[PDB]
Symmetry: C3
Subunit: 421 residues, 3 copies
């Protein structure tokens, strides 16, 4: 039995009092994670190669995930059963090296570690034919499923409160990877087509996006004992709200009282991203990100987000290091033109298993400082039935209220482990 | 650590739109499973032989089961903790080869794979003394527990709404197996006695079945590189509603609003079943079932169910096959005499680990067609307080309503893995 | 992968009817467990040494716990994710042999097996530096976290119903162990300081304990092939309600309707405990406890509890034994001066893996008799809003009601396994 997974767990304090607090910019889809993670999260994977004859094999893999508040010993939770799939490798003679698979799977996910941000993730229930050797690269085909909680009506209606039936969304994914385009440099291209897939006689609200595309281009360059990844993605309509390869064609969301409201996602997203991790000598490693993400919707409630950060690591010893993370977010509301910004600074002393910035496990002792200035926020007051602005970006002081996190400061400290195995 | 279990997971589409739909006859207790399974289901077993001295050993076994809708990646659920037991083998010198056990256990279950139907299952919390060598066969004794959600009142009452206290049911099970009765043929006999087991001063509703028996006879014949099982079972009163060896003596059920209603199970069940799996040459395997099950209740709301189906497999290659499944159900309401029927046809291309129809894992690509014609259904409209017919079989058009699945067609397709290890 | 854990599971009957019932004295914090455990409880631990170079290593450990009613096969539950931590051993050159750790962990827990009673348990999310070699002993430092469900208000208020915000409690723990003080005798000393840790501008109710101390002294003596532990603990204010090393500074509790009520824990607790397990020849083992615990609160609602019990084991054979357990509880309400008492007698035939009273797994067949006489109980009628006495000790016949378990008898029997591996 193969035992693999991911986990993080710790204990933290907020400088002004109480348990650790974590700092994310209103409107940003990520935060700089170092010394800024407020939950115990674990994935326990049990897998096995259950049959092997020569070059041919079947591999079975599972994944059970737990997320708890880490404020107590006994923390009862609903585990998420995320993966259960079988991979059949080298079973098709005319397509040597290629894998056939079906089941729930984390399918070739692309992320930026330091902000824990997945930018290409179509994971879910699915099936496909992977790694077809096409001479100048590897071709992979897959179909995966996601579902919105409501969005569909069984009868013709102009009332959005009738659109409460779950709507399956399908994604069809084609990727062509490992194209050697320059010395030490590979290129990967992907296309995703996603669409709401309605039951017979069901309908989406008038104007629903329904379907959409996501186009990806990723260049990977071997540099300074590490790598650089330069990414450009462009998404359309139904693919803009999740933004990582899953479709949300219904354009319907629900408040806490189960009232439906319209979040039409017609429009486009442009994401330009560069990240990597490099070594400078034998004492220094560094991770870095810079990203510009523009989500432009027809309803005007999109966002324009810039991020940049660095995470240098100084190795005193093969297992002991000093790690620092500096991260900056700036988010502009499309609706109001206001801007939200934050800069976060973390200092950590770390013991890790190996001398790389990728080495895990790691035990950290840290101190974090964040300073933010938010001039807008989302209006989630009342409910969607009472409030016509429910879910719209709004200036910080709209109607005498307070929206967004204001203009303030805070520091946290504590200890944490992180591991993948 | 031994890692074992069962899992199935896939992605599917309904021809008229939306996610895969699965087809079961109203009134039947099973469906033809090939290309007709609409959830991700997994049992993860971790066990260990924790002590061994010579012939003597203790084995520890567990089982955590997950069932999710396979419509999304993150699917939070309540896992069922189904097994946790210790088996002590060869500990009693005067009963060589026998096992003593206690804990929650899947105890000698008998099922028909292709319709995923358990016909002899008393699994639950329990204890027993298994495999006593009695010369001409093996004798096993066990006691297991189940519990109805309500059914018991703490005081004398004529109001069925007072019978809301959980009622434990005990089953006492004696089996005599492995009797060689003919060349290549074994016989197994079993008796189950089950009864509601009331707390001091609690009561069942007047007329409650209370207790009941289940008698089983199974003949196993080695034929054509596989087997044939011919089964006859007869159950009485409290053993008829579950019908696999667990008792439900209280005869009380609850609607969604927690209103109690009477489902007295006085009466009998006769089940005549034949199933097996045979090989025809080196290229053909086949599974087959035929069953007749008559549940005759004093209240007239029983059923009379006929099933038959076959699942031939053509082996093109040692790992690649074409599998087809054809299944037919016919259910007659005891109450009205109407009939519900369905025929399902599935075609699949499959890659599996081995050249048997029992070989797992298996990756399937399938297409399923079902056609049904239902003239009756159960009335679950209103609640048990408003509706005197709550839970009764009822003609399809009763009182201008629509009951059962009507007279229609549908086709589905998709991909799926199944594995036991 | 290392597979470790704890589990118990069985089936039982109550002499007067229905499923097994378990017997605990009102006011006691424990019960004599043999033949007196009414649930299936399991901890499944998966761990791994993920990196090792010479003397240095990192160990990763997890723990998922399940507790179900063992009344049915399919028992869906919320597993508790109790442990997820990394232990870095021998990483600090100037502190040889010491371990640095962070994550959720069962930290050096001290319990009395036979009454399943933890007397020193600060487990939870935490971090620390363990086993510092200090010449004449081992020094350990740790900080762990716990949280009360409510207790904090965001604004100044005299209304206890406003104090509904969770309040983090921190515990700082220092232990000095393994001091050889006499031949075959070790001494361990510990100090815990715990305090409610309020968010900025939040408050506790007027008079809240807020913080407190727990002082522990444990002497361990090697005797008669086993051991004797003699324990003295003294706790103050916020450390008295949980009583094992976790703080509950807020002094606020909630009824079932979410009404807050005051359980101020100002006062002190004195615990004097002696327990051990000894061998008498080759045929006899015995576990025993004696404890006096006095919880003296300023509000008068504390308790004074005496327990004593013994568990002799007669070994007929290396794997087969006859086990008996006799246990007595006596609890006096501080408020009324009434006394609750119970004596429990259990007889079991057992098969176990090894010839010790500590050997597991064990398969038991038992009969239990309990006789109790309770002259007081806690008033949990109405809710905290209607009832001024909510939660107070009260004479058995207070206001014509019935409080406590009365004056009665009962016997149970069944089978059970228990294992740790
Ligand atoms: O698939 C990535 C996706 O998973 C989520 C949970 O829905 O994040 C969790 O899982 C990740 C590993 O699979 C971790 O990186 C992350 O810390 C954890 O919360 C989404 O947030 C993420 O986009
Ligand atoms: O004990 C069989 C019994 O389990 C149920 C769930 O209550 O079926 C689940 O478990 C079986 C394996 O233990 C699978 O065959 C089945 O697919 C799964 O749903 C009952 O349906 C069944 O009678
Ligand atoms: O840490 C001990 C603490 O855990 C509890 C559950 O909250 O007990 C459970 O876990 C123990 C093992 O970790 C078992 O000994 C016990 O039987 C089980 O209920 C608390 O009751 C106990 O104080
Ligand atoms: Mg402005
Ligand atoms: Mg008719
Ligand atoms: Mg739940
Ligand atoms: Mg009195």
């Amino acid at each position: 039995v193969d035992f693999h997974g991911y986990a993080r767990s710790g204990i933290g304090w907020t400088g002004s009092g109480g348990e650790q607090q974590c700092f994310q910019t209103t409107g940003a889809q990520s935060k700089y994670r170092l010394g800024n993670e407020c939950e115990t999260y674990a994935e326990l994977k049990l897998g096995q190669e259950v049959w092997k004859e020569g070059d041919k094999s079947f591999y079975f893999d599972t994944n059970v995930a737990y997320s708890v508040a880490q404020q107590n010993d006994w923390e009862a939770t609903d585990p998420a059963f995320r993966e259960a799939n079988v991979q059949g490798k080298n079973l098709i003679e005319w397509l040597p090296g290629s894998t056939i698979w079906a089941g729930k799977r984390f399918y070739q996910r692309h992320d930026v570690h330091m902000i824990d941000f997945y930018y290409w993730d179509i994971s879910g229930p699915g099936a496909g034919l992977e790694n077809i050797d096409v001479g100048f690269g590897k071709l992979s085909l897959a179909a995966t499923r996601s579902s919105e909680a409501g969005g569909s009506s069984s009868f013709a209606s102009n009332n959005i409160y009738d659109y409460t039936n779950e709507t399956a969304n399908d994604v069809f994914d084609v990727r062509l990877a490992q194209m050697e385009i320059n010395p030490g440099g590979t290129l990967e291209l992907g296309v995703d087509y996603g669409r709401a897939n309605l039951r017979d006689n069901y309908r989406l609200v008038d104007g629903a996006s329904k379907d959409g595309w996501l186009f990806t281009a990723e260049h990977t360059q071997s540099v300074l004992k590490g790598f650089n990844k330069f990414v450009v993605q462009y998404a359309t309509d139904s693919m803009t709200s999740q933004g990582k390869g899953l479709s949300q064609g219904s354009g319907v969301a629900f408040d806490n009282e189960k009232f439906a409201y319209n979040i039409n996602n017609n429009g486009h997203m442009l994401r330009i991203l560069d990240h990597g991790a490099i070594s400078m000598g034998d004492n220094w490693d560094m991770m870095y990100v810079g990203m510009y993400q523009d989500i432009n919707w027809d309803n005007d409630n999109g966002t324009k987000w810039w991020t940049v950060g660095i995470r240098p690591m100084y190795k005193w010893t093969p297992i002991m290091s000093t790690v620092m993370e500096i991260g900056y977010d700036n988010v502009e509301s499309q609706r109001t033109g206001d801007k939200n910004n934050q800069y976060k600074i973390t200092l950590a002393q770390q013991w890790q298993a190996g001398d790389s910035i990728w080495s895990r496990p790691a035990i950290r002792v840290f101190a974090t400082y964040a300073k933010w200035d938010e001039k807008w926020g989302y209006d989630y007051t009342g409910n969607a039935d009472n409030n016509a602005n429910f879910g719209k970006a709004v200036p910080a002081d709209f109607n005498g209220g307070s929206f967004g996190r204001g203009d303030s400061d805070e520091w946290t400290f504590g200890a944490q482990m992180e591991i993948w195995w």
